[PDB]
Amino acid sequence: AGVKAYELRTKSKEQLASQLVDLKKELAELKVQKLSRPSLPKIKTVRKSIACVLTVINEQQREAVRQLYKGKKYQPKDLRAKKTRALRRALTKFEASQVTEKQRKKQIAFPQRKYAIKA
Amino acid sequence: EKAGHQTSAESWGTGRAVARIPRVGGGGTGRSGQGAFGNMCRGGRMFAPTKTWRKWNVKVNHNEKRYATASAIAATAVASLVLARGHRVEKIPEIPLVVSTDLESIQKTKEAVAALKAVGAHSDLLKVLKSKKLRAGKGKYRNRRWTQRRGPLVVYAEDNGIVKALRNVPGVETANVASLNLLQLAPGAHLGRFVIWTEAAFTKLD
């Protein structure tokens, strides 16, 4: 098992750094033990624990930055949506719906009507 | 279109004491020096490769088509030809068989089947329920594992559940009078099916 991110996400940056340091220390010692003994797979768990810790830390900074750029014009390029290149260019809903005033008048005057053919 | 053609094999000619099919060049591999483009070579190009624009479908005169259906229908009323295929029509209250139109309103396969056994198609439905056999060719790995006989044809005018009540009973086919597929009426091009008509259908034939 080991550690769990839902337990870690309640912690702070400093506690997480200490945790990470402890994990790297332990990992170093385990590498020493790995040649003293034929096999040692407890090292996998601490390896994955480091990954989980780094993920959470990255998340904290990233969400801090996001709430910092909350509702700003230029967001960072690693924080915009990725959708795909051709879309990140292409028109917006606004620009697509932009319409000249002549066409507006014709649409309002003569829109397509609902009709039926019986009698 | 590219099979047998992906090679770049060109003939060595004559003067190398061998046949002048095109050979693969290069080296260091078993294929190096091997015969190529050809129906007779391994890894080659079959004779007259199969094309999609073979004629697959056949236009037949519409009248001739209707003629054949009429002949099949007339053969439906001949007990010899139905017996001759091995439709089980030995007992038969009377032929052509006509049933009340209330059978179109059956929703359950069980109720319909019970009716069928009562009229006397049990032996034919057992001809199917005992003829299920494996196929002898290579069809089994072409999604044609099982072979069995062809049972009776129920003819309805209006569908009110019977077709779905009968889509699971093996060997039995259904039809509307309007359509009447020849493939059902003369399977294997052998005339005389055991046809069960409904009253409404028998009237609508005129």
Binding site: - | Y141, N143, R145, R167, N168
Partner: protein
């Protein structure tokens, strides 16, 4: 007899799927039916199989034998059972592998999720 076009009766795709399928779906393919007693109890016939349930056999050379699951083997589509072991000439005991469809359950290694599922399926 299918009606849904989205389904296929292709031999190849079927066998392909069954062999390449993952542990998730193999959990279902290794389902087993229940005893008459358990069926009477819960109004249901079969379940995915799991470990530590009890079981009896109904087929095969080992028919009539009983036991509990030592271990599931979804990688072989099989089961392994205490009280069911071949003795080699070296005398080593070795478990025999079984397809669950040829078994019957007598007890259930019951769990929150298991009971929830049980009430989930009903038994229409």
């Amino acid at each position: 007899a299918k009606q849904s076009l989205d389904v296929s009766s292709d031999r190849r795709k079927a066998r392909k799927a069954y062999f390449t399928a993952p542990s998730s779906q193999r959990r279902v393919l290794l389902s087993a039916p229940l005893s008459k007693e358990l069926r009477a109890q819960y109004g249901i016939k079969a379940l995915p199989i799991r470990r530590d349930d009890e079981v009896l056999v109904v087929r095969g050379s080992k028919k009539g034998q009983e036991g509990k699951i030592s271990s599931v083997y979804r990688l072989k589509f099989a089961v392994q059972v205490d009280k069911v072991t071949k003795e080699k000439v070296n005398g080593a005991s070795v478990p025999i592998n079984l397809h669950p469809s040829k078994l019957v359950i007598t007890k259930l290694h019951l769990d929150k999720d298991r009971k929830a599922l049980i009430q989930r399926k009903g038994g229409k």
